[PDB]
Each structure stands twice: as structure tokens, then as C-alpha cells.
Design a protein around this ligand. Structure first.
Ligand SMILES: OC[C@H]1O[C@@H](O)[C@H](O)[C@@H](O)[C@@H]1O
Ligand SMILES: [Ca+2]
Lengths: 272, 123
């Protein structure tokens, strides 16, 4: 077989993204027969240079996941990617630790296949244009550039939240992401800080191609604004060398292989 | 209400240059402080911070959960959860003159560079 084209001929461009019609994962499987156990897909027509592990931090949002799966599987196949879906479920009731769950996704995904690209995505963001490729670029890639939550615009230039993609090398370079941010906010600013310190810039598609829709929800008591976030962000330069991939610890409580994705439930400890 | 950068910027124009803080710095600060939400309510170890400016009941406003607060601003904290910013601004000015910009922890890390992006160009 031959290499897949730089751009897929399957792309459709803008899509109507709606969260009304309930979805039936069984139907989603029905419609996505090429996706194998554990949510893995590899093109049969061509060879893709993009081996992508899509990492989703998660805790009790199965309803958002159904929509994510419903919309992304067809998109990712269209983008002709050799990919796998990993939902990192945070066990327990401590405050949500997004960045640490993403670190777990990186290590765990690597046990399955030799991925060279990692896409980090919140469960509640769906891209509205399939030209916004869910793969890695020569520089760290910020994907959810124009979300409705912000009036289809980037809230601030240093914003690296929502959905992003880092090559294995770009990730390793910054010692992965922080493990010490509990509760909402700042961890993505820390990551932005790490990238900038390693001399990288953020690559982004334009605001038109990068539009995303967010599935709404009410304040999460398990993820209240983090009071120390600002001090943490202010010290990334020093803490990035001691808090990240190299200091990651967790306990896997279960690895679940469903037909549409792999859900890894983990015990990531508590704040200290 | 979640305001836009420009709604916020127009509404707090009076604070511009006060204590040497520009409107660009404020637009930056308010975004990371409350997401421009005039009804933001946040807990911070036993204290509660209110509104656009996230003014704390610890020293600045009077809340029902802490009626003995010093209430330096001389205002009920509930008045900081509406869309009328004149009183929020008057309180922020007292915080700036007494404690200084560092009351807002987002200032240093998020608003020390790239300020131009925070400009509102809307008349
Ligand atoms: O919601 C937008 C972004 O706002 C910022 O002020 C927070 O620090 C980030 O964690 C968040 O992703
Ligand atoms: Ca008010």
C-alpha cells in the first residue's frame, strides 16, 4: 500500500454539530464497522504516518462521551488517521486533575502501540470542520481555537486548553504535563508555559477551520476553581523539571476495552 | 451575566490608569479572575469572592456567612453579583489604593506581556 495523501480526499469541511437526538453507542458501532475492539482504526486503503492516541480526561460524563464518540469516529476515519481512543477515568471523589489524567493516557496508550502523536481532548468539545486535523504538527498544536463558549474566538493568545495535540517528542521535551494541579484552571496555562520554555511556538488552524462546539453542563462541585493556580502558573519554569512524566505515579483499577474505546480507570491519589 | 471583553472594558473605563493600571491590564485580569461573569462566586479556603472583580468577604464586603467582616468597602457582597458595576469599581479602587494590584493573583502570571490583545476597539 501507498502513503495517504497529505490531505484526505474524504474531507467534508463544515459539519452541523447538534446534541439533541440521543445517541445509541450500539448504533455508533453499527455505523463504524471499521473500528476494532478498544476503539482502534487503521486505514486499509493507505498507510498513515500519523499514529494518534486520542486521550480524554474523564469522570462521570458518559452522556458527553456518547456524543464525542458519535461525532469523532467518522471524522477521524475521514482524516485517515491510524488512531486509538483512550478515556482516562478518574476514580474517587478528589478534585478533578485533568493534566495528570492526560499524563496517564500518554503512558498507558504507549503500552498498546508505538504512537507518535497524542491528541488531548476534553469530552465536551466537538470540532465543526473536519479540515481541523486531529494529528500532530511540527510545533505543538492547539486545536479548539474557536469554541462557541468564547464566541467562536480564541479567549487569549496563550490559551492551550480544550483540545491539543503534541508529537511524542514535543511531549517528552517538556517532561509531559504537571501532576500538581487539582481542581479547575491553570494546568493548560502551565503546559503553554512549558512549551514556550522549551522554545516551541503554538501552531493553530484559523478561526474558521478551528470552530468547535461545546456540550453544555452545570458547575462541577468536584472541579472547583483552584486557589493556587496563579502561583503555580507563575513558577512553571522551576517546577516543570520535577513535576511531570518523570514524577508520575498512579494505580490502574481497570482497563476496559469496549468496541468504540478503551476506558482506563485510575487512582491518581490526592492533593499534597 | 457573562460579559464580553468590550462590555467590561466600556463599563470600567473610569478605572483606567487608576493606581497606574491600564484598561488593557484590567481586561486581562478580569478575564482570568472571573471569566467576565458578574455573578461569579468562588470559595477560597473559608472565604468567598464575588463578582467580576472577585472581591472577598474576608476584608472587603459584608456577606451573611461572615457578617463580622471588616467590610472595608462598606457594601453588601450581593451588590457585587449584579450587572451594575459602579459599586464593584468603587470597591476595586479601595483595594487598589490600600492593598494594591497584587490582590488579583492573575495579574503577574497572565498579564505581564502581550497586552495589546486585550484592547477593545469597539466604540
Ligand atoms: O476557560 C478558559 C481558560 O481560562 C483561564 O483563565 C484558565 O486559567 C484556564 O485553565 C482555562 O482553560
Ligand atoms: Ca454591582
Amino acid at each position: 500500500l501507498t502513503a495517504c495523501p497529505e490531505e484526505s480526499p474524504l474531507l467534508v469541511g463544515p459539519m452541523l454539530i447538534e446534541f439533541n437526538i440521543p445517541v445509541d453507542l450500539k448504533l455508533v458501532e453499527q455505523q463504524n464497522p471499521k473500528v476494532k475492539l478498544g476503539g482502534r482504526y487503521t486505514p486499509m486503503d493507505c498507510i498513515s504516518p500519523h499514529k494518534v492516541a486520542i486521550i480524554i480526561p474523564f469522570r462521570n460524563r458518559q452522556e458527553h462521551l456518547k456524543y464525542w464518540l458519535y461525532y469523532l469516529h467518522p471524522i477521524l476515519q475521514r482524516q485517515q488517521l491510524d488512531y486509538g481512543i483512550y478515556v482516562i477515568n478518574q476514580a474517587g471523589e478528589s478534585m478533578f486533575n485533568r493534566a495528570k489524567l492526560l499524563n496517564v493516557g500518554f503512558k498507558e496508550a504507549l503500552k498498546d502501540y508505538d504512537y507518535n502523536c497524542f491528541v488531548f481532548s476534553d469530552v465536551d468539545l466537538i470540532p465543526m470542520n473536519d479540515h481541523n486535523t486531529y494529528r500532530c504538527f511540527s510545533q505543538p498544536r492547539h486545536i479548539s481555537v474557536a469554541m462557541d463558549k468564547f464566541g467562536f474566538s480564541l479567549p487569549y493568545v496563550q490559551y492551550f486548553g480544550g483540545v491539543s495535540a503534541l508529537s511524542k517528542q514535543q511531549f517528552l521535551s517538556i517532561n509531559g504535563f504537571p501532576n500538581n494541579y487539582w481542581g479547575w484552571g491553570g494546568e493548560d496555562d502551565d503546559i503553554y508555559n512549558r512549551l514556550a520554555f522549551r522554545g516551541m511556538s503554538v501552531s493553530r488552524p484559523n478561526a474558521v477551520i478551528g470552530k468547535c462546539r461545546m456540550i453544555r453542563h452545570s458547575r462541577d462541585k468536584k472541579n472547583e476553581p483552584n486557589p493556587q493556580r496563579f502561583d503555580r502558573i507563575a513558577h512553571t519554569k522551576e517546577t516543570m523539571l520535577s513535576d511531570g512524566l518523570n514524577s508520575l505515579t498512579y494505580m490502574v483499577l481497570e482497563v476496559q476495552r469496549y468496541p468504540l474505546y478503551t476506558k482506563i480507570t485510575v487512582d491518581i491519589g490526592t492533593p499534597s | 451575566t457573562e460579559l464580553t471583553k468590550c462590555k467590561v472594558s466600556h463599563a470600567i473605563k473610569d478605572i483606567d490608569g487608576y493606581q497606574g493600571i491600564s484598561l488593557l491590564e484590567w481586561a486581562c485580569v478580569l478575564f482570568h479572575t472571573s471569566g467576565y461573569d458578574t455573578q461569579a462566586v468562588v470559595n477560597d479556603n473559608g472565604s468567598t469572592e464575588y463578582g467580576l472583580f472577585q472581591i472577598s468577604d474576608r476584608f472587603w464586603c459584608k456577606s451573611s456567612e461572615f457578617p463580622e467582616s471588616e467590610n472595608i468597602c462598606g457594601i453588601s457582597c450581593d451588590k457585587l453579583l449584579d450587572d451594575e458595576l459602579d459599586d464593584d469599581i468603587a470597591c476595586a479602587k479601595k483595594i487598589l489604593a490600600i492593598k494594591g494590584i497584587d490582590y488579583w493573583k492573575a495579574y503577574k502570571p497572565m498579564c505581564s506581556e502581550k497586552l495589546e490583545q486585550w484592547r477593545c476597539e469597539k466604540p
